[PDB]
DNA sequence: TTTTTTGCATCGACTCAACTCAGCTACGTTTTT
DNA sequence: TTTTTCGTAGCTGAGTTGAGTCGATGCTTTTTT
């Protein structure tokens, strides 16, 4: 005999782990990290919302499949932490919620409304009226150069604005990588939500085309209440090991503004604003 | 949610990893977590399913008078006896 | 659509290619340009910079069961891209295009025109009817008695259709499109891999499962559907029909 | 006042009982109990002074992101690991 | 190779536990024996209060073991009517006892521990320069109106609080389930006042007695707490009222600070007699 | 006045009387009329019966070591009747009854009256005085090597063989004379000449008789140096205890110490 | 060309740690004011 | 009259439960639209 395993609710759970020795496996069907020297460490990964795996993991199948089954996030993260692969539930979306999410997508007048209160829910004011999605976006551009320039005045670091270099690493801007790392954590937990409540990443209103469309919309409007403020906060003292202080500061925002809990609500909401009843 | 710990003893290995899924095993068939109510009674269902019969307790904290409550499956030689509205373990010989 | 199903090694890269990995060696050279999808089969162990390397080609990892016979994890999850998601979508919520599918997939799965009589409700009535001659047919010429506690038969049947929603699953995925967007079933996070199913079920994967129920389970069942996705590229041939189903919808298809 | 879980392996009998005084003993070197902070730091040092070549961990419940702390005194192969600010067990030979 | 054993603040306690066997001391635990031989481990150390029914046998380590610990002993008989109490034998500090002492024998600093006993008891001031007998007249009074009127909102037939000190069914279930109930809070409140420091005998309100001390402070908040419940038991009629009326004192106990307000309770209600406290 | 001291079995009643039962059956018969104090020594187990029996008759029943060199538990905690407290309180608080007292204890220590030019705090220099000239005296009629009486309380082993004899002698005397006050019915804690700590009283009896039997026997152990002094000046405190009765005649020492206040005493 | 190679659960025998108890022997003791 | 009787802790040697691993075998499966 053997009984079914069903996923906890996502505010329930710790918000992500990152994963860096040796190799994933499953024991006695639960999953467990196990390095060169044999040390085995168990990883409660159905309490866990998002499973970072660094550098030098190695998944097995049965892996992978008990963390779709428990339903957690894996995702696969590259150096200075930034979000590169992610594998979950292959069903994992809801006919109603899939469609509603998509007919809000196709029929442009949704998708204003759709933008507008993710406008209103980001910046906390009612958007200008009468304004269209490009121009709206415009605005969004100028108020995130002025929230940038803001921040960095306060914790007192110099900004030349938000640049990477996508071949080498180390030639990108303290700042920016710990900018780069947090958004990737913020990314981890929204894919993680909105998996969970049965939409599609891909789908977005804002940002529209690529993969994480509808991730970066959600998160946008909530990254700069949690992550980004703490991102400058670890840039200011110039930190040997940057990632890492930036991976306890999501954690440990995630917990204290309720992330987790208020993601999945958030969606839903700014999708209402939209027209037709869930 | 409140902090729940679950001891078994002779439970097949199945359970034993099933209970590594959601809590954090600090010794031998001692688990520990912080849970939710329906969490717990998930956990709980999981055990009645799977320690076939070896024995488990499982305890978690409350706002009752001793602080906590707790409950047992299969038989084991520390049974809780109820005394005057507060439950404790006795022994048998 | 490329594809390659990879078993029993470690996926990792050499030279930035994919590799897979036993202790004798590398088992199976793979090259960046020649895959879309990789299909990771039970014993199977992912390297980060496998991960990677696919991740900057944009290669779909799928693990999957033997032949596919279950899907269990996918990246790129909840569908890569946006276009064909809504393709697809803009197909099923209108009904008159709903109907324009419906209609092509009676076809593929019939042979014959449906009736211009039509919507969706009064056919599925039909196709119902259809379904029990086969059924009975079938029962007949294999000479298996005809009508989880049940009749090894069934189980049988059940055992197959449940793998064939697998190599389905696998196909959709595989072609870009959503799991859970379907026109004749609906609702149902599988609404369109059962649609897709029940077009292909009877050409050959019932029939075997009851031969097997005459041969008298589960398990033999399962494996004789691995075999028979294996041979006859079941998953390869899936994935044009799946895109000439919904090409099917007046509307012309993304790139 | 947080729940109190004390788990004992290989200590002298005279620790069982003075942990008995407190706690609640509800398996073998298995114990419970709801108390204070200076209680729990109380019970601590008994175990300490106490549990000569045994091995003890000690966990409660907090406000902390897990949801409770432990410590530990002696050794055993299951260690409290430091992971990106989690504590959590390996098992070792 | 051997530790202290202090005894744990009484808010941080359970306030009492009935028993029961024989009660023996195992590796330094307090541990409560059966005839079939089945031992219950029993926290003693997290108890302000155990109180011993009839057949039970308490070993010379166990009493030991119990005023290491500090926790008060109360041999009880049937009606769960406090009989005698064993305790730690030095548990009187001298401070706190001389201050009760001197707050004890002059009669004007007597006067206010009294008046400050009865504005705690009724809420609202006494009047002014009356004496100790006269106010005892007056509490007497607002004593047996108490009794009526709860006797009236839980419709008791109540003829008064009378009792017979050899038999056991000579008395109304009400009178009994009041004497259990008060027994109860004479027990958390010996642990109270034994814990300060002070003395059970020396009282004010009562005097002579063992337990004067005991009575006086009791008395404050034996209608607040544990009384209504008595008549709430009385009500119901029950077969064995004494387990109820256990059970009914310990959560309302628990839930109206009851322990952890006892003494500073002591500490007020002496601080009214204008000399200033040891700490 | 009147107690007895049992060990070695369980109390229980018969026919309304105390009684000691073993294995052999009753041990010890007590009518209820004779005893006021039962001290209970190791390996008794009291039956409830018992305790209900000795509650009736207002029988204070008392946890102690062999002969009472150790208190552990007693019955109507914290004392039983008022009066007694009240009594040692006002002769406490009151100085000049407070020196009235101190300088009878005094005299019951010495033999001869304080000087009458002197008060409590310019005496206790001089029984101080005295107390070191005894242990000098002491100290090698016996044959013990001697620099003075001192300790740390927070290690035993750091001080000489015969000082830490000397402890658990002091300790032991200690023992009984609480129950002696327990006994008479008094508060240990209230003293007059020392003060402050819960055993003030206790002190103040036990250093009266200090010297009588106690501190040469402790000089005496100190001196062949057995392997185990603490066990052996235990014991041998408790057998002086049970030979010369000292709890019996430590009550009526107490209430003449009291008496000397010139306030007339309870009944 | 004849390329059978991996991860994971189950099971049965073995080692090993530790609890539990019985019979035996000491002991009435953790002190100092 | 010669009345050694009790409770409790430490020790040591036996029965016993249960955890933990190794090596061998079976399997890639917990299904139904």
Same mark, same amino acid.
């Given at each position: 005999?053997?009984?079914?395993?069903?996923?906890? =609710?996502?505010?329930?759970?710790?918000?992500?782990?990152?994963?860096?020795?040796?190799?994933?496996?499953?024991?006695?069907?639960?999953?467990?990290?196990?390095?060169?020297?044999?040390?085995?460490?168990?990883?409660?990964?159905?309490?866990?919302?998002?499973?970072?795996?660094?550098?030098?993991?190695?998944?097995?199948?049965?892996?992978?499949?008990?963390?779709?089954?428990?339903?957690? +996030?894996?995702?696969?993260?590259?150096?200075?932490?930034?979000?590169?692969?992610?594998?979950?539930?292959?069903?994992?979306?809801?006919?109603?919620?899939?469609?509603?999410?998509?007919? /809000?997508?196709?029929?442009?007048?949704?998708?204003?409304?759709?933008?507008?209160?993710?406008?209103?829910?980001?910046?906390?004011? =009612?958007?200008?009226?009468?304004?269209?999605?490009?121009?709206?976006?415009?605005?969004?551009?100028?108020?995130?150069?002025?929230?940038?320039?803001?921040?960095?005045?306060?914790?007192?670091?110099?900004?030349?604005?938000?640049?990477?270099?996508?071949?080498?690493?180390?030639?990108?801007?303290?700042?920016?990588?710990?900018?780069?790392?947090?958004?990737?954590?913020?990314?981890?937990?929204?894919?993680?939500?909105?998996?969970?409540?049965?939409?599609?990443?891909?789908?977005?209103?804002?940002?529209?085309?690529?993969?994480?469309?509808?991730?970066?919309?959600?998160?946008?409007?909530?990254?700069?209440?949690?992550?980004?403020?703490?991102?400058?906060?670890?840039?200011?003292?110039?930190?040997?090991?940057?990632?890492?202080?930036?991976? +306890?500061?999501?954690?440990?925002?995630?917990?204290?503004?309720?992330?987790?809990?208020?993601?999945?609500?958030?969606?839903?909401?700014? /999708?209402?604003?939209?027209?037709?009843?869930? | 949610?409140?902090?729940?710990?679950?001891?078994?003893?002779?439970?097949?290995?199945?359970?034993?990893?099933?209970?590594?899924?959601?809590?954090?095993?600090?010794?031998?068939?001692?688990?520990?977590?912080?849970?939710?109510?329906?969490?717990?009674?998930?956990?709980?269902?999981?055990?009645?399913?799977?320690?076939?019969?070896?024995?488990?307790?499982?305890?978690?904290?409350?706002?009752?008078?001793?602080?906590?409550?707790?409950?047992?499956?299969?038989?084991?030689?520390?049974?809780?006896?109820?005394?005057?509205?507060?439950?404790?373990?006795?022994?048998?010989?």
């Amino acid at each position: 005999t053997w009984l079914p395993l069903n996923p906890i =609710p996502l505010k329930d759970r710790v918000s992500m782990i990152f994963l860096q020795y040796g190799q994933i496996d499953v024991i006695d069907g639960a999953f467990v990290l196990i390095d060169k020297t044999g040390i085995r460490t168990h990883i409660p990964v159905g309490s866990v919302a998002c499973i970072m795996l660094e550098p030098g993991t190695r998944v097995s199948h049965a892996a992978v499949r008990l963390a779709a089954q428990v339903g957690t +996030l894996l995702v696969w993260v590259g150096e200075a932490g930034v979000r590169v692969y992610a594998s979950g539930q292959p069903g994992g979306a809801r006919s109603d919620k899939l469609l509603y999410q998509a007919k /809000l997508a196709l029929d442009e007048d949704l998708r204003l409304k759709v933008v507008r209160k993710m406008f209103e829910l980001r910046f906390g004011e =009612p958007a200008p009226a009468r304004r269209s999605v490009e121009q709206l976006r415009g605005i969004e551009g100028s108020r995130v150069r002025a929230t940038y320039a803001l921040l960095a005045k306060q914790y007192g670091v110099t900004w030349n604005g938000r640049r990477y270099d996508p071949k080498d690493w180390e030639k990108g801007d303290t700042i920016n990588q710990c900018i780069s790392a947090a958004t990737s954590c913020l990314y981890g937990v929204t894919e993680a939500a909105i998996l969970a409540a049965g939409y599609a990443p891909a789908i977005g209103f804002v940002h529209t085309g690529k993969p994480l469309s509808f991730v970066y919309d959600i998160a946008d409007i909530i990254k700069f209440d949690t992550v980004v403020p703490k991102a400058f906060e670890i840039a200011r003292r110039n930190p040997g090991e940057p990632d890492r202080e930036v991976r +306890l500061a999501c954690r440990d925002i995630f917990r204290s503004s309720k992330t987790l809990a208020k993601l999945i609500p958030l969606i839903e909401d700014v /999708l209402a604003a939209g027209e037709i009843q869930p | 949610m409140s902090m729940l710990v679950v001891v078994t003893e002779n439970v097949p290995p199945r359970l034993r990893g099933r209970l590594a899924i959601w809590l954090l095993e600090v010794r031998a068939g001692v688990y520990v977590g912080d849970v939710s109510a329906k969490i717990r009674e998930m956990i709980w269902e999981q055990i009645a399913g799977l320690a076939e019969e070896g024995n488990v307790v499982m305890a978690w904290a409350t706002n009752t008078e001793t602080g906590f409550e707790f409950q047992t499956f299969g038989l084991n030689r520390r049974t809780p006896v109820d005394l005057d509205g507060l439950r404790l373990v006795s022994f048998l010989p």
